[PDB]
Amino acid sequence: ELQEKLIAVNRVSKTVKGGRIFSFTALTVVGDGNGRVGFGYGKAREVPAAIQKAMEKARRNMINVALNNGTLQHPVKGVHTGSRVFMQPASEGTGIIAGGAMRAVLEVAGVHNVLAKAYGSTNPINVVRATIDGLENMNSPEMVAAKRGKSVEEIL
Amino acid sequence: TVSMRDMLKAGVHFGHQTRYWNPKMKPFIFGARNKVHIINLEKTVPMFNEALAELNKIASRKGKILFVGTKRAASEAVKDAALSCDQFFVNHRWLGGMLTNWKTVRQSIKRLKDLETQSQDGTFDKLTKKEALMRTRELEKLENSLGGIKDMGGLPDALFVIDADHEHIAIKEANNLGIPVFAIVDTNSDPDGVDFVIPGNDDAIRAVTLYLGAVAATVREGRSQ
Amino acid sequence: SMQDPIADMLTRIRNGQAANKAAVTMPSSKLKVAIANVLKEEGFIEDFKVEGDTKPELELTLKYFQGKAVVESIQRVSRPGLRIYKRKDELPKVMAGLGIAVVSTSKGVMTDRAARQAGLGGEIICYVA
Amino acid sequence: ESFAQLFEESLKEIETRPGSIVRGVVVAIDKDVVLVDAGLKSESAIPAEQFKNAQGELEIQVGDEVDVALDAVEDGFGETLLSREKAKRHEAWITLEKAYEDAETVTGVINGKVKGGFTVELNGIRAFLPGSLVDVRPVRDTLHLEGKELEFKVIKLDQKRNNVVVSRRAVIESEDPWVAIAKRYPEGTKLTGRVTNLTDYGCFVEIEEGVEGLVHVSEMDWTNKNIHPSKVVNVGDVVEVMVLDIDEERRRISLGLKQ
Amino acid sequence: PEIGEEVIEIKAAARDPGSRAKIAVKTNDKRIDPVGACVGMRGARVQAVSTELGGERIDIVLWDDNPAQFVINAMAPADVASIVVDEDKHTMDIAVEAGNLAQAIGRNGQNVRLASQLSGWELNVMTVDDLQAKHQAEAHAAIDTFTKYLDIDEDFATVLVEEGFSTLEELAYVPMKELLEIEGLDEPTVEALRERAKNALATIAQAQEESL
RNA sequence: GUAAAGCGCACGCAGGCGGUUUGUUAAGUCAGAUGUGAAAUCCCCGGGCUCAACCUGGGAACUGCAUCUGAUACUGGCAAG
RNA sequence: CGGCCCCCUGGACGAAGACUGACGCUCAGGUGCGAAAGCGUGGGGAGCAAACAGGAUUAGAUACCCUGGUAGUCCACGCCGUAAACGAUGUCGACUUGGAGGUUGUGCCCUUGAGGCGUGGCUUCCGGAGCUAACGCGUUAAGUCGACCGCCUGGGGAGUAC
Numbered sequence A: 001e002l003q004e005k006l007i008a009v010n011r012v013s014k015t016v017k018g019g020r021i022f023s024f025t026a027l028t029v030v031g032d033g034n035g036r037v038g039f040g041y042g043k044a045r046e047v048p049a050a051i052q053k054a055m056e057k058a059r060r061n062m063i064n065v066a067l068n069n070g071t072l073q074h075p076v077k078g079v080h081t082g083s084r085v086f087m088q089p090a091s092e093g094t095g096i097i098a099g100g101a102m103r104a105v106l107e108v109a110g111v112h113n114v115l116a117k118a119y120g121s122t123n124p125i126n127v128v129r130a131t132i133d134g135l136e137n138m139n140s141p142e143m144v145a146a147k148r149g150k151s152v153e154e155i156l
Numbered sequence B: 001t002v003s004m005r006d007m008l009k010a011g012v013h014f015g016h017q018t019r020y021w022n023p024k025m026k027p028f029i030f031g032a033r034n035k036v037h038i039i040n041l042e043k044t045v046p047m048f049n050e051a052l053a054e055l056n057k058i059a060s061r062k063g064k065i066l067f068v069g070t071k072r073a074a075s076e077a078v079k080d081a082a083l084s085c086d087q088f089f090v091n092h093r094w095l096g097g098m099l100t101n102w103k104t105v106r107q108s109i110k111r112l113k114d115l116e117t118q119s120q121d122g123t124f125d126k127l128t129k130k131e132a133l134m135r136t137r138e139l140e141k142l143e144n145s146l147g148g149i150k151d152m153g154g155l156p157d158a159l160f161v162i163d164a165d166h167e168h169i170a171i172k173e174a175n176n177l178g179i180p181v182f183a184i185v186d187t188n189s190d191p192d193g194v195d196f197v198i199p200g201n202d203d204a205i206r207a208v209t210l211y212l213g214a215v216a217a218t219v220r221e222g223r224s225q
Numbered sequence C: 001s002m003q004d005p006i007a008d009m010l011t012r013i014r015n016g017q018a019a020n021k022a023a024v025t026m027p028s029s030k031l032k033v034a035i036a037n038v039l040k041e042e043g044f045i046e047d048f049k050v051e052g053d054t055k056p057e058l059e060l061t062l063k064y065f066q067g068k069a070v071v072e073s074i075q076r077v078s079r080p081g082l083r084i085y086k087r088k089d090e091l092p093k094v095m096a097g098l099g100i101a102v103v104s105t106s107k108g109v110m111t112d113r114a115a116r117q118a119g120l121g122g123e124i125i126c127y128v129a
Numbered sequence D: 001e002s003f004a005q006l007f008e009e010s011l012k013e014i015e016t017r018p019g020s021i022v023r024g025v026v027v028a029i030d031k032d033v034v035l036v037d038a039g040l041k042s043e044s045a046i047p048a049e050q051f052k053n054a055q056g057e058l059e060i061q062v063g064d065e066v067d068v069a070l071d072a073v074e075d076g077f078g079e080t081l082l083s084r085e086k087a088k089r090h091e092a093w094i095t096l097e098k099a100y101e102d103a104e105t106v107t108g109v110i111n112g113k114v115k116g117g118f119t120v121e122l123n124g125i126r127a128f129l130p131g132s133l134v135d136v137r138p139v140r141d142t143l144h145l146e147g148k149e150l151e152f153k154v155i156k157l158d159q160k161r162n163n164v165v166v167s168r169r170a171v172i173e174s175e176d177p178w179v180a181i182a183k184r185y186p187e188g189t190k191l192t193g194r195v196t197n198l199t200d201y202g203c204f205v206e207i208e209e210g211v212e213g214l215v216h217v218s219e220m221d222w223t224n225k226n227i228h229p230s231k232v233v234n235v236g237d238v239v240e241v242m243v244l245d246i247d248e249e250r251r252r253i254s255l256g257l258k259q
Numbered sequence E: 001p002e003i004g005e006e007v008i009e010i011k012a013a014a015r016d017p018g019s020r021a022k023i024a025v026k027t028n029d030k031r032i033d034p035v036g037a038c039v040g041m042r043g044a045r046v047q048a049v050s051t052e053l054g055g056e057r058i059d060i061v062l063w064d065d066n067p068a069q070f071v072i073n074a075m076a077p078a079d080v081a082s083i084v085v086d087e088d089k090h091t092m093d094i095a096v097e098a099g100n101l102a103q104a105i106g107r108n109g110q111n112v113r114l115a116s117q118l119s120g121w122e123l124n125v126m127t128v129d130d131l132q133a134k135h136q137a138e139a140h141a142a143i144d145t146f147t148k149y150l151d152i153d154e155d156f157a158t159v160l161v162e163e164g165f166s167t168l169e170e171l172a173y174v175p176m177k178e179l180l181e182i183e184g185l186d187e188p189t190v191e192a193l194r195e196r197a198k199n200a201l202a203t204i205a206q207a208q209e210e211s212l
Numbered sequence F: 001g002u003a004a005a006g007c008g009c010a011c012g013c014a015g016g017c018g019g020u021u022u023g024u025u026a027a028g029u030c031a032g033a034u035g036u037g038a039a040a041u042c043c044c045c046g047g048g049c050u051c052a053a054c055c056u057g058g059g060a061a062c063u064g065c066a067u068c069u070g071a072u073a074c075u076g077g078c079a080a081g
Numbered sequence G: 001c002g003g004c005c006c007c008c009u010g011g012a013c014g015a016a017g018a019c020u021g022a023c024g025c026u027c028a029g030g031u032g033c034g035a036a037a038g039c040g041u042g043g044g045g046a047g048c049a050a051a052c053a054g055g056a057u058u059a060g061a062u063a064c065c066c067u068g069g070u071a072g073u074c075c076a077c078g079c080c081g082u083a084a085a086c087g088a089u090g091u092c093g094a095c096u097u098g099g100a101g102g103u104u105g106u107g108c109c110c111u112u113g114a115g116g117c118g119u120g121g122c123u124u125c126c127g128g129a130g131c132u133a134a135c136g137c138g139u140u141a142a143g144u145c146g147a148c149c150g151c152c153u154g155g156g157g158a159g160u161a162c
Helices: A047-059 A101-109 A124-137 A141-148 B004-010 B023-028 B041-060 B075-084 B102-122 B129-146 B168-177 B205-224 C005-018 C030-041 C112-118 D002-013 D084-101 E034-039 E044-050 E068-075 E098-105 E128-139 E154-163 E190-211
Strands: A003-015 A020-031 A037-044 A076-080 A083-089 A114-120 B014-017 B029-032 B036-039 B065-068 B088-090 B158-161 B181-184 B196-198 C023-027 C045-051 C057-062 C074-076 C100-105 C108-111 C122-128 D028-030 D033-035 D117-121 D126-129 D154-157 D164-166 E020-025 E057-062
Touching: A003 A047, A003 A101, A003 A124, A020 A047, A020 A101, A020 A124, A037 A047, A037 A101, A037 A124, A076 A124, A083 A101, A083 A124, A101 A114, A101 A124, B004 B041, B004 B205, B023 B029, B023 B041, B029 D002, B041 B065, B041 B158, B041 B181, B041 B196, B041 B205, B065 B075, B065 B205, B075 B088, B075 B205, B102 B129, B158 B168, B168 B181, B181 B205, C005 C023, C005 C030, C005 C057, C005 C074, C005 C122, C030 C045, C030 C057, C030 C100, C030 C108, C030 C122, C100 C112, C108 C112, D084 D154, D117 D164, D126 D164, E020 E034, E020 E068, E034 E044, E034 E057, E044 E057, E057 E068
Parallel strands: B065 B088, B065 B158, B158 B181, B181 B196, E020 E057
Antiparallel strands: A003 A020, A020 A037, A076 A083, A083 A114, B014 B036, B029 B036, C023 C057, C045 C057, C074 C122, C100 C108, C100 C122, D028 D033, D117 D126, D154 D164
């Protein structure tokens, strides 16, 4: 039921007395096609093991997101370290207008319709984190009604 | 259940000095006496009662309780308390990642159990002396570390702690896993990670004992229920 | 020097929400009062109380729902350096309608929805979410 | 309610700062630490050497009560300054009692003049005296049976510096530190001084009215450099020391202990 | 292996080997997901038990909290909506709809026994309409019993039993202040009418004395 | 602050911004109307060339400017505090 | 900016009151002050010391080290107008958890003692939330905001040429 996308894999080095020890980092993200989403960032000497780790980590520490039907509930900004991200709810049919790692996380999240730009850095890791942050902070109408002591129709 | 007079007698109301406090504890502080913080018993009591009730409820559903104190003043007492209600405890140094990294520690438990078996049930004696001394030493080490939690099986369903600042590693583990935390929190301590905080003197022995005894009684009650 | 009182208000509120302050006090002004009233109506705060004769002090009481604050965001829009005036058609929607935009109009200060209903625009004071 | 506020001020009313109210019940003994609870934030890590009387064995079991001392709080965890100092206040009260009737009567046995004046000891403690006071007249207890028993009749006390000289015999007979710092001066006046803190080059014995002495590291013993003062004497103990040197200007009285 | 390392709280296993094997399991809230681990990648481990000892309809239910959530979980895999309770023998009265009852009940002698041991006691699968039918068959009876309790005039009794919840059968132990809100409450008399019902219970005990 | 980027420091004209209360004005601001904003182009609904491009009817738009009539919370002016 | 004294003189802070009644903040151009070195004229010249000379060192030593040593450093009056002129952090105002100090006021308190409880100004260190690329900053912000100004737009060429 869960869908999982390996966003990126990158070779990283550690210099030692002999020479360079190489290793691989795997950035993955998983989601159930609904609110729930989680990213994982694994590392191992070989690629498949590292992606396996990324999947494992993503599977835990997931996070829920309040989706109005296929899209978002309102425009939302999210940042992390360099990657600053804007994403905006959009009409059915438009699809996921987003670039790169961001796209991937959106798809697994089960959002189908967004207009979305990544300002600043586009370092996959940071940008996916920023996306997750923007999705988490985003609140729903019912939530704001509760926050504020009102009905949904009062807020419209 | 536990009265205010008794707590006063114990020395709960006493709290750390005025240069060592935490401003998140400002609500729980009443005043400062001889440049020493006083804990507000009026606000402490009801919450302590609450915490007791929650612990009882946990017990009723057959919850596993872990008693943590590594202050080495009240290690004996926390062990005693754990045993009275036949629950589990960590009276010596908490192993970093005992709960988060359970699966590894579970092997540790198993090795300890095997060693215990060898010692007692085998009755095999006839072991090379140095080797026998080494095995004995290993047994002692593992008993000290994991004696209380050996029969635990899996992960506790609640975590009682005697000092938050001292056992912050355990607290953090519980939070990461989501285990309910029941902490005694002096003025210097940080109660943010704690779910059911308890403002009381972690240091004084009699106060610690009192805390323990009430907790044990309510666990026993929940078991009876 | 102090140049924008309203903005100072909003910053005070923001800082109180951040710091989990129960109530936030500051010198009173009519526009400030009206803004506070609007917020209360829109439920971002519990209650506001002006007190004093010579130099009265507005005291708002801040709102906290499940630990975290109610006023998720609060920005000035109009400011002394650069004023913003909006016509009724052009009026904004804060957080896609979930938040509000305080707007001063000829018929008083009101939320953006209220202004739209009335059929008139004006100076956009602040967004609240 | 105000129950608690009234209690807080009640409990203020029923404790004081110094070691005055004998309140701490000995709730755990083990060698070499005694511990009490005088209604303080924590329990005191008491030495055994505050509580053995005059021949080297303990005297108080569980439940027993002595007050300790205060006005210093939490070096990082714990509570007190020790209780024998409390006993010093009782000794001071006994000495003051003399004033009432102009005669304090105890046993006082003064064999030899440490710093000019015979040393007189009251039950547990031993204090040092100025010369004249040991004897009412030139009688000179050197010809008396050693460590003889008479009493103490006060000849001289310094009234800020605990130097008290008393008259053993003859029952029938009946700023501030630094201007005139020439009393213990001449070359070699020995003193009885409690050490305060050993700074790994020193010991800081300093007793005589707000002064500072250093018996630092060189004498201390009859080994020079491998000594490490903490091993060789004590913490908080009244000892043999004498001046050897005074600055009245740069306030460095450089005592010694090899004597 | 999670279950083996105390990560999947498995209490009872009310299952019928050789047919259906539905069992619920709890877990310490720590992003574990008990059923998920028991299932695996597209029922990876689920298929193992499926063709383990023989073609069995193994099922896993995400245990929520206490026995109330165990009831619905014992009705799975299906669609429970509500259920009744009692004392020692609560008898979980399954409340579903005819359309969903076909799958819920599954087989007359299969899911009625497999889900009966699920809670350890026994369940009584019923229908949404059935519940209401029996529900009313209870309102009339604290009244449907020849009215052997308080009793006074009948014209006042009808207007009192109109607003009266659960008739008057032992209702004095409930709130004795909301019937005073009723249009007509001078001196404590209705608070006394309930006392009459208590006396009626004593009278019923006297009737037991007449029969014992 | 360290990546480019705080005048070496001040005073200070012009300029920019301006505590709080009342009154007034109505310049800014907002609302409505009138006049205009060529046609074509763009966009919406239609029609005609077999379709399309293309042609084409009606609308919308042309975010503006000018006026007149209102509104007066805010900003401004004036008067008193 | 550092020995004492005197004469003339600017600012800061506190204590209470009394008064004025928005008179305020910022500031392109403009004006002033602006280390050291340097320049001009006139004085002065102990020590130190660019330049210079000799002796060493060295492969060489137009340096480092040694012996000497003149401009200058000092004073008066002018000019110069720059420095890693740095907190590499523009000015003014408001708001946001704490601890340990220093310094300088001041209110009360039995100063019963060097103290006890406050309340102001300036100031050093640590550290929370928050912020930050991180380092770190952290009520003296690099946090949360407002007003005004200054400045940046790849490295070199170049802060150079005209």
